[PDB]
Amino acid sequence: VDDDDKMLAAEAANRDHVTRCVAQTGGSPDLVAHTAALRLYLRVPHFLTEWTTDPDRRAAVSRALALDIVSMKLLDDLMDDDTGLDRVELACVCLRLHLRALHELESLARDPKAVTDILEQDAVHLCGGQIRTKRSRATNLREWRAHASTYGSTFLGRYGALAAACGGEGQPADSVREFAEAFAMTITMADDLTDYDRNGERDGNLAHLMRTGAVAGQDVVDLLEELRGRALAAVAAPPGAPGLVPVVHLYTDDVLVRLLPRHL
Amino acid sequence: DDDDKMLAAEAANRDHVTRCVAQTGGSPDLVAHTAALRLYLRVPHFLTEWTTDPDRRAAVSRALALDIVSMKLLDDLMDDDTGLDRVELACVCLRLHLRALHELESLARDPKAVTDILEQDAVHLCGGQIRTKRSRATNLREWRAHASTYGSTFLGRYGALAAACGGEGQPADSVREFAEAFAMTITMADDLTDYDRNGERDGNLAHLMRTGAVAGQDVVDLLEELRGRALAAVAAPPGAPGLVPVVHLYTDDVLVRLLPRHLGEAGAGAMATVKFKYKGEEKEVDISKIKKVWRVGKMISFTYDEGGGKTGRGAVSEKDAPKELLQMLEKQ
Ligand SMILES: CC(C)=CCC/C(C)=C/COP(=O)(O)OP(=O)(O)O
Ligand SMILES: CC(C)=CCC/C(C)=C/COP(=O)(O)OP(=O)(O)O
């Protein structure tokens, strides 16, 4: 029973916790499926909870983060209005998952107030940020990383901070967050480079900029190595989360080896 | 002077919500939209009426505004007909809601009380709104069952939160009972306004009324039941007598201004009658047939139409005279 076995059951456990919740509140089969297709969103919680020693607390915190991440994901499909899904169901399942998560995270936290504290602290940064991103599209790598630092980095960093606040002792809150923010930027690029052909995306899309020459391949490569670096350092701060080392390499090499050549 | 309080609390809630929408990146459209949510911004004052400390009362009041407004934005996002920008709505919605959780939690009697309340009936609320839009109402009963969720359960939660967040002397149960009753009253009013203001028809109460599928007198009864439920709640000790005029104002507004727009010619149903014994007989007459009516002591004398040119006569005691007749009296 290695680490990959833990990741997979963590992922199955989160998905089921989420689909059960979507269904119990009125979600149509289309919506239930759509949520179970959110693979990485259901898996990331497991990485954020890697510093949590007690396995029972870890599974609980893991699925509570999953409910809220899926929730924000649905609110997003709601603002893009392109999934063909029912807007009432989307809006409602979204509110429900979110409320259940709050309730689950608060009952796991050392101090209940810290959940709202984390969620409020950079709510303007995340929300004004998401707005600016869709308002004015990026045209160079600088503006891209700037935008991505909010809907990707800040977005996962909050779940990192929550993971630490609800994971008991032996949690270097600052590092978990550093890890999350760097890991997120990496995933955002991947997503961007996948979605160019899977979603038909262009405006502000990193792949589009690369293909148009507005962004140089080696810069993208640098950013990727920097992120890898920031992530390795974060999972090395005491107590440490050596489990995440191979994970950081997996997602980074995948963008370098599989995704990038597609655009260069 | 209590009206001077409702106005100032509404203005303060409005200020707090607009500044917040503005700082998060909301366009002036959206800012204008949230500032327009008048009753939404004003209801908080009603919910916090049992809060003795003014400073605390203002803080809970504006925190509730933040979340009610946020929920209304989400609702606009699910209808997608405000013309407002889908992204600003979603993000401003989330920002406000988050702000609200934080402010409410800071005033709560207990750490988990806010989230307990929000979770308790999350499913009833959410799944209820889903079913409301999924199966339009076809009779009053169905209408009331749907309104019980996005209406009564919706405001009831903020009622519970005001009690949880407003220090001592809060009859939790009564605050929530007032909110749920008052919510439905306001929901009916909205439905009968929005039939013409938004062009609404499917599952809409005015429509069901105009359609014959829902009877006027029933709507009047439900309205009366709601008024009584609300009055009782604000009567529980320590009491919130200040809400009495409020309860009457909204209930009476639906009965007097809104209802006639969808019934027409006396939608109560019981076309009034005058019973009397004329020429050794038994007679009853629809107030609609009564022509002239005058008073002689405590007797009410009158004439009416029997058929064709035919003109009938009658006189009753004023204590056997239906309200309507005694009205033609004064009005003649
Ligand atoms: C403030 C809010 C609600 C933000 C949306 C949450 C989010 C960024 C989800 C993941 O992004 P994504 O890369 O899968 O989606 P997108 O195509 O919109 O960038
Ligand atoms: C589950 C959720 C988020 C439900 C939305 C909340 C709601 C219906 C609020 C009251 O709006 P309203 O009924 O007074 O206005 P309208 O329905 O006309 O938009």
Q: Judge if the beta carbon of residue B72 lies within 6 A of ligand 2.
A: yes
User: How would you write B247-273 as a 3-class SS string?
Assistant: HHHHHHHHHHHHCHHHHCCCCCCCCCE
d(CA B32, CA B260): 32
d(CA A254, CA B205): 57
Q: Chain A interface, mutation test: which of B23, B89, B94, most A Cβ atoms within 10 Å? A: B94
**Could you write out the DSSP letters of every residue in B92-139?**
HHHHHHHHHHHHHHHH-SSTTHHHHHHHHTHHHHHHHHHHHHHS---S
User: Do you find a cis peptide bond into B245, omega within 30 degrees of 0?
Assistant: no
Helix, coil or strand: residue B158: helix
Q: Which fold has domain A1-264?
A: Farnesyl Diphosphate Synthase (1.10.600)
CB contact under 8 A, A25 and B102: no
Q: Hey, is the C-beta of B88 within 8 angstroms of any chain A C-beta?
A: yes
Q: Which fold has domain B270-332?
A: OB fold (Dihydrolipoamide Acetyltransferase, E2P) (2.40.50)
Task: Compute CA A134 distance to the chain's CA centroid, rounded to the nearest angstrom.
Answer: 18
Find residues 207-236 of chain A whose CB sits inside 8 Å of chain B: none
Q: Hey, is the C-beta of A32 within 8 angstroms of any chain B C-beta?
A: no
CB contact under 8 A, B130 and A96: no
CB within 8 A of A134, min separation 6: which ones?
A: A79, A204, B87
Rg of chain A (C-alpha set):
18
Considering Cα of A78, then B186, then B41, then B172, what sign does the dihedral take? negative
Strand arrangement, sheet containing B299-307: B290-296, B299-307, B310-317
> Which ligand approaches the C-alpha of residue A152 most closely?
1
CB contact under 8 A, A123 and B98: yes
Q: Domain residue spans in chain A?
A: 1-264
Q: Residue A84: left (phi > 0), alpha (psi -120 to 50), or beta?
A: left
The partner residue sitting opposite A95, judged by closest CB among B25, B74, B88, is B74
End-to-end alpha carbon distance in chain B? 39
Smallest CA–CA distance, residue B119 to chain A, in Å, is 6
Note whether A231 and A244 are within 8 A (CB): yes
Considering Cα of A164, then A165, then A168, then A174, what sign does the dihedral take? positive
Contacts of B118 in chain A (CB under 8 A): 99, 102-103
CB contact under 8 A, A102 and B118: yes
Residue of the nearest CA to atom 16 in ligand 1? A76
CB within 8 A of A97, min separation 6: which ones?
A: A18, A21, A22, A67, A68, A70, A71, A74
**Could you write out the DSSP letters of every residue in A185-215?**
HHHHHHHHHHHHHHS---TT-HHHHHHTTSS
Architecture of domain B1-269: Orthogonal Bundle (1.10)
Burial class from Cβ neighbours inside 10 Å (0-12, 13-18, 19+) for residue B301 reads middle
CB contact under 8 A, B131 and A26: yes
The alpha carbon torsion through B199, B204, B209, B211 (nearest 10 deg) reads 70
Contacts of B164 in chain A (CB under 8 A): none
Note whether A189 and A206 are within 8 A (CB): yes
Contacts of A120 in chain B (CB under 8 A): 98-99, 101-102
What's the resolution in A?
Answer: 2.6
Burial class from Cβ neighbours inside 10 Å (0-12, 13-18, 19+) for residue B331 reads exposed
CA of A74 to the centre of ligand 1 (A): 9
d(CA A153, CA B165): 34
Find residues 134-163 of chain A whose CB sits inside 8 Å of chain B: 134-135
Q: Which of A42, A76, A126 to mutate to test the pocket of ligand 1 (most atoms within 8 A of CB)?
A: A76
Q: State the CB neighbour count (10 A cutoff) for residue B294.
A: 13
The closest-lying atom of ligand 1 relative to the alpha carbon of residue A191 is 13
CB contact under 8 A, B95 and A124: yes
- The contacts found for B32-39 with CB under 8 angstroms, 24 or more apart, are B33/B76, B33/B82, B33/B84, B34/B69, B34/B73, B34/B92, B37/B68, B37/B69, B37/B72, B38/B10, B39/B186
Give the residue from chain B lying closest to A106, CA to CA.
Answer: B112
> Which ligand approaches the C-alpha of residue A148 most closely?
1
Q: Hey, is the C-beta of B23 within 8 angstroms of any chain A C-beta?
A: yes
> Which ligand approaches the C-alpha of residue B77 most closely?
2
Angle at A235 between CA A232 and CA A239, to 5 degrees: 145
Q: How many residues does chain B have?
A: 332
CA of A44 to the centre of ligand 1 (A): 14
User: Do you find a cis peptide bond into B238, omega within 30 degrees of 0?
Assistant: yes
Contacts of A106 in chain B (CB under 8 A): 111-112, 115
